[PDB]
């Protein structure tokens, strides 16, 4: 995984040159948003279970997804969906802190569609739960932080379809 | 099922089913009608089994149906009775199959994760199943009740 700082450092090392003015401005931009990201990651980690619980309550419960024949039906498959949403929030938080979605590409999306297709997990329902994770998260981290978190929760959704 | 359970036990040892296993299967198929009658009994009186057991539960655990309780309000109360209906149906699956795996695979693996995510007090769920076991037992003879009780006790023992 690379964060925003690493991308600047790697963009210059590949050319074998010191950090010039333009690179310093990219570092400055990231340094400016450091409090925004750190504050959001603090509240998310405090409310992780609550964010998933209310995202599920608002998105998947009391639908055909949880009723007999739906993919969340049975206690085993309910837990698996909860575990997956815990992944997507924790890794979206990593991406938000790093200002970069590489960790999502490497640790999340690589082979995810193959896995879900083999198990029959519905993609569209998974995207709704993640979008509900986004809306619940935004209401808790404020609007600015929820905007940055939305970028990386949208990235997972995009990589799933 | 008893057949699947013995097959997986035999496959795990790369062997044909033993005479002991084959005799257990033979007895189960030959006592088949008696089990289906018990399942028919549970199925037909499912409305009263769940309602009476649910009525008893809220008397035994009034907090769950009080402000701040997981089952507070008629709608949450309905979902609690639905859940009890789920578990009763699973007990009837176990009865006709002569094995608990249909119960386990459908409604006990990850049950702790599911109910802690929902905030439901799981031990009260164990109580609700317990209540269904009395109501069901009082609707059949002692020998039939004993056969169904084993599966009620398995659900109770797992959630609790």
């Amino acid at each position: 995984m690379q964060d925003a700082i690493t991308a600047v450092i790697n963009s210059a090392d590949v050319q074998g040159k010191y950090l010039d003015g333009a690179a310093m401005d990219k570092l400055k931009s990231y340094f400016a948003s450091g409090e925004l990201r750190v504050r959001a990651a603090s509240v998310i980690s405090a409310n992780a279970a609550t964010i998933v619980k209310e995202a599920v309550a608002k998105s998947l419960l009391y639908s055909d997804v949880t009723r007999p024949g739906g993919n969340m039906y049975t206690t085993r498959r309910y837990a698996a969906c909860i575990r997956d949403l815990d992944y997507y929030l924790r890794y979206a938080t990593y991406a938000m802190l790093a200002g970069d979605a590489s960790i999502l590409d490497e640790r999340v999306l690589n082979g995810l569609k193959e896995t879900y297709n083999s198990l029959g997990v519905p993609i569209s329902s998974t995207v709704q739960a993640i979008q509900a994770i986004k809306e619940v998260t935004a209401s808790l981290v404020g609007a600015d932080a929820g905007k940055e978190m939305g970028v990386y929760l949208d990235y997972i959704c995009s990589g799933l379809s | 099922s008893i057949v699947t359970k013995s097959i997986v036990n035999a496959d795990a040892e790369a062997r044909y089913l033993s005479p002991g296993e084959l005799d257990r299967i033979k007895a189960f198929v030959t006592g088949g009608a008696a089990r289906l009658r018990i399942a028919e009994t549970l199925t037909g009186s499912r409305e009263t089994i769940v309602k009476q057991a649910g009525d008893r539960l809220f008397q035994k655990r009034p907090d769950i149906v009080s402000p701040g309780g997981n089952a507070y309000g008629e709608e949450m109360t309905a979902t609690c009775l639905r859940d009890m209906d789920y578990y009763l149906r699973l007990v009837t699956y176990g009865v006709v199959s002569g094995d608990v795996t249909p119960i386990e695979e459908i409604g006990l693996v990850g049950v702790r994760e599911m109910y802690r995510s929902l905030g439901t007090p799981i031990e009260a769920v164990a109580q609700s199943v317990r209540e269904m076991k009395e109501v069901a037992s009082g609707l059949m003879s002692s020998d039939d009740a004993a056969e169904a009780s084993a599966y009620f006790d398995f659900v109770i023992g797992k959630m609790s």
Partner: peptide, 4 residues
Amino acid sequence: RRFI
């Protein structure tokens, strides 16, 4: 808590 409502499921409707």
